Design a protein around this ligand. Structure first.
Ligand code: PIK
Ligand code: PCW
Ligand code: PIO
Lengths: 782, 50, 50
């Protein structure tokens, strides 16, 4: 009768013993474990403000460290969120703020600092203290972009560990530093005040270290903005009194909130209305509006617990790009002017943006610039495939006698280099060296040529041939070719980087068939007159087989631009990235499990011995009911394995189905945008003929410096010409700049209006019976 | 006492260290709980009014 | 009130409670407070962790 039904079911089961004095605050719950040795590294972990002061006022150090892990005294203070003593040091026992930084940015043995060790544990009450110090400007270091030695930073630690309460705080200060510091605008000052009071009302339980006068946390930061929140409360009620005096059809961040009832400040989390208070206000500060939407999406995609906001910022990025109506308006919201030199095209290429580069207006700015003659569209006619195919075989014969001569002539002849600079303009078919489609065709016609000569080599191989079968003319020309492929990959490893290099998938196969055939060319020579054995001879025939596959897997690259075979190169690539490396680690477990079981069944025994070891009964490969008991386990093992592989093949048919059905033209058109932009910033050379001038540019550049000197237009050995911008419409210089500004204000002020309406409509849907109830509540009052 | 107990999955441990809070941490939980639950019970009382 | 609700949810297999952001956060700061589970996504992590 003494227990209840709730009591039997829900209370704590066992009987415990109450500890005499056991605290549960973050420090001082660990006195039995860390100790109390009195050494400023224990006085900060435990949170003893007095024993930190007295051990320093008489004694030790401030920045001594442990042996295995290099944690300072500071790095234990924010390991266990003792902001009480970090605030003690900053107020007194430090001056000269370069000493405040170097005490926080000291390092660890993995690489942490004071705002990464308070970030990979959720320590709001301390992460709100270092964030407090940046806004005041105490640190001269920007101690949030620093990396440890793992690539991580302050926000990649709190995102992977899953501390959602801290990711929200690390992201409000990054939405705050976007908006410009000194700006006279009554509505960027609203949304800077709405975000610092989002942090100040979020700490608000973080008393100082002493009585003091509350200091709460952000007093010195809210008092530096100059925004009266009640005078600005009526700047919008009077501007949106008759249609709009903020020139954006209202006050542009002002709605109802008629007032909801109970019957029958508090917006602490980051809402969508918070993120458009940034995009409106960053646009009213001068910034690119497409740049802020791409920047705010890159923030929230490393926050990892914000998927209802990345879905909204990817939907606004495609909604901006459909407000744009012709090509003249698309390239006026994407162009960097002289005022804000911020390209959003090249930043979408650098962060692998699928939803932007797949769009039909972004696929048009590439193909305007990459084709410009229409010779792609000549392959959809009866009379165009015939004539277009004839110009390939003639020009590739013409790109065999003038291409090695112009490569040599540009080294030593100054008239021919200025003749090879008659582009960078409206570039047309008069000078086919500078239109980016034709340089793609000479790349592929020099690549079908490589796998014909390689597969002719394995067929026209005569075995009864002496030691000049190793050093033949054709066998050593293919080795010079693959020598010059490897030097071209090291150039486009250093120039375009590592994240771009390992994001194509063909740069691996250019190395691996070159490295195999150049190792086939060496080990064949050694195994024919030095050491003539079949141990390394069968490696030589194994490299040429490996180097003949990766030649022919490289020749599906001509189909990348074709629709209907382009999306089969991408659904086979993504299948080898995403799926195969998680199913092959389970087929390896199932097949090794099945293989050890078959050895254990088909295992011979010995029944015939009277003295010692006469005979043994033979069992197969790997009366008396004897061959039946084992075969009913042979049938169970084979059925429960073949069913287990088929269960795993349905799991792969249904993973590639969801990517084929949703996202196949998106993966196809993303690669075209990544392919049309590589050949824009590239010369016309091919893998066999770059080495022909990488020796000449080592000579022809130097000969103009010893006697002439400042010659000019010397052939650069670096590929990816970095002087010229990506598109020709990037920086206007005059009346084009005044027209683009009129077109981007026209477009994006009608992007931002049709989001203010479409957000309010979803507020009036869900809160429709409260507007009707407020229209009847006035009968109640007045 | 303090025998190595002949069982795994120890029973003489509350799972987390922030369980039964004796002292003036009980008075601060009970305040902080009543803030959370009173702000929850009147967002149901709003959503049951709509 | 001696009533624990975390121990009752993993006794009655409560998949909606027991996989929230805030419940996966109070288990992680006891299971893995150092982030060793993320020394796999790097080359330094696999060599030095392995
Ligand atoms: C056992 C393996 C079976 C494989 C079956 C191959 C079937 C060939 C089908 C025809 C090939 C067409 C499609 C191949 C195109 C291709 O690109 O190859 C794929 C690549 C996959 O990597 P990735 O380059 O895309 O590199 C990725 C990529 O860049 C991602 O985009 C990145 O992510 P990101 O986007 O963030 O940058 C990844 O980094 P992360 O770690 O972050 O994920 C990075 O690893 O695979 C291959 O190239 C190999 C495929 C053919 C094998 C040829 C070599 C085999 C030769 C052995 C012969 C045996 C003979 C020995 C006995 C004589
Ligand atoms: C290999 C490279 C690809 C070569 C092109 C092969 C494709 C066939 C194109 C075609 O079908 O031909 C029609 C095109 C379109 O010309 P259009 O009538 O539109 O007006 C152009 C007159 N404009 C400039 C005054 C306006 O014309 C042309 O491409 C001219 C035909 C191309 C022949 C010389 C190209 C040499 C290529 C690379 C240099 C070698 C080093
Ligand atoms: C002889 C070729 C001369 C011209 C070179 C032509 C260079 C070239 O890219 O064509 C590749 C060719 C044809 O495919 P192709 O590119 O013409 O595919 C069409 C092309 O992409 C159009 O631009 C697309 O329209 P849009 O953009 O969406 O508006 C169209 O889609 P749709 O809307 O109509 O449905 C596509 O069908 O595919 C091969 O077989 C490889 C031969 C490579 C040859 C390698 C060297 C031997």
């Amino acid at each position: 009768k003494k227990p209840s039904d709730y009591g039997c079911q829900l209370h704590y089961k066992h009987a415990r013993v109450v500890e005499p004095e056991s605290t549960t605050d973050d420090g001082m719950k660990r006195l039995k474990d860390v100790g109390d040795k009195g050494t400023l590294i224990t006085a900060a972990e435990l949170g003893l403000v007095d024993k930190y002061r007295d051990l320093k006022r008489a004694g030790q150090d401030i920045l001594t460290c442990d042996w295995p892990y290099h944690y300072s005294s500071i790095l234990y203070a924010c390991y266990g969120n003792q902001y009480k003593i970090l605030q003690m040091v900053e107020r007194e026992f430090v001056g000269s703020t370069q000493e405040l930084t170097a005490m926080h940015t000291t390092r660890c043995w993995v690489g942490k600092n004071s705002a990464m060790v308070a970030a990979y544990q959720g320590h709001l009450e301390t992460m709100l203290y270092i964030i407090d110090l940046d806004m005041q400007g105490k640190f001269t270091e920007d101690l949030f972009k620093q990396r440890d030695v793992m690539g991580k930073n302050a926000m990649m630690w709190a995102a992977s560990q899953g501390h959602t309460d801290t990711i929200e705080v690390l992201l409000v200060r990054s939405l705050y530093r976007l908006l410009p510091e000194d700006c006279a605008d009554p509505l960027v000052l609203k949304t800077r005040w709405k975000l610092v009071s989002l942090l100040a009302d979020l700490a608000s339980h973080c008393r100082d270290y002493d009585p003091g006068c509350s200091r709460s946390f952000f007093q010195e930061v809210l008092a530096s903005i100059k925004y009266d929140p009640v005078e600005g409360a009526r700047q919008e009620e009077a501007a949106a009194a008759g249609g709009g005096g903020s020139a954006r059809e209202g006050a542009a961040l002002h709605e109802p909130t008629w007032g909801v009832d109970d019957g029958e400040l508090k917006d602490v989390h980051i809402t969508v209305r918070t993120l458009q208070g940034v995009i409106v206000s960053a646009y009213r500060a001068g910034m690119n509006c497409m740049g802020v939407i791409m920047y705010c999406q890159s923030l929230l995609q490393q926050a990892r617990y914000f998927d209802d906001l990345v879905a909204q910022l990817t939907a606004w990025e495609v909604k901006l790009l459909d407000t744009c109506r012709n090509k003249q308006e698309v390239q006026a919201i994407l162009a960097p002017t002289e005022d804000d030199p911020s390209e959003p095209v090249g930043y979408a290429l650098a962060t692998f943006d699928k939803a932007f580069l797949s769009h039909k207006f972004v696929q048009q700015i590439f193909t305007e610039k990459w084709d410009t003659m229409g010779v792609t569209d000549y392959t959809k006619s009866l009379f165009g495939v015939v004539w277009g195919g004839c110009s390939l075989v003639v020009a590739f014969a013409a790109w065999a006698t003038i291409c090695p001569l112009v490569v040599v002539a540009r080294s030593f002849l100054s008239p021919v280099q200025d003749f090879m600079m008659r582009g960078k303009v409206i570039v047309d078919s008069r000078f086919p060296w500078h239109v980016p489609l034709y340089r793609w065709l000479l790349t592929q016609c020099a690549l079908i040529t490589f796998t014909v000569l390689l597969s002719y080599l394995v067929f026209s191989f005569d075995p009864s041939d002496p030691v000049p079968a190793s050093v033949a003319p054709l066998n050593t020309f293919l080795a010079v070719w693959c020598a010059a492929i490897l030097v071209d990959e090291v150039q486009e490893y250093v120039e375009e980087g590592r994240a771009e290099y390992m994001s194509s998938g063909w740069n691996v196969m250019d190395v691996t068939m070159a490295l195999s055939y150049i190792l086939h060319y060496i080990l064949r020579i050694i195994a024919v007159r030095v050491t003539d054995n079949l141990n390394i001879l069968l490696v030589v025939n194994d490299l040429l087989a490996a180097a003949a596959l990766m030649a022919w897997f490289r020749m599906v690259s001509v189909f990348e631009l074709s629709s209907a075979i382009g999306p089969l190169i991408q659904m086979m690539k993504q299948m080898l990235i995403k799926d195969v490396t998680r199913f092959a680690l389970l087929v390896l477990v199932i097949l090794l499990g099945f293989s050890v079981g078959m050895e254990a069944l088909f295992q011979e025994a010995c029944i015939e011995r009277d003295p010692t070891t006469n005979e043994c009964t033979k069992y197969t490969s790997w009366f008396e009911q004897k061959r039946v008991t084992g075969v009913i386990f042979y049938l169970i093992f084979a059925i429960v394995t073949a069913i287990l592989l088929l269960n795993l093949f349905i799991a792969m048919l249904a993973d590639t189905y969801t990517r084929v059905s949703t996202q196949a033209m998106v993966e196809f058109r993303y690669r075209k945008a990544k392919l049309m932009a590589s050949y824009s910033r590239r010369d016309f050379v091919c893998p066999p003929f770059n080495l022909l001038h990488l020796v000449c540019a080592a000579v022809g550049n130097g000969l103009r410096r010893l006697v002439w000197g400042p010659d000019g237009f010397t052939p650069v050995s670096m590929r990816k010409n970095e002087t010229v911008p990506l598109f020709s419409w990037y920086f206007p210089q005059g009346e084009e700049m005044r027209q683009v500004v009129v077109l981007q204000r026209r477009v994006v002020d009608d992007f931002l209006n049709s989001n203010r309406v479409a957000l309010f409509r979803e507020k009036l849907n869900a809160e429709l019976p409260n507007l009707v109830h407020e229209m009847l509540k006035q009968k109640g009052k007045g």
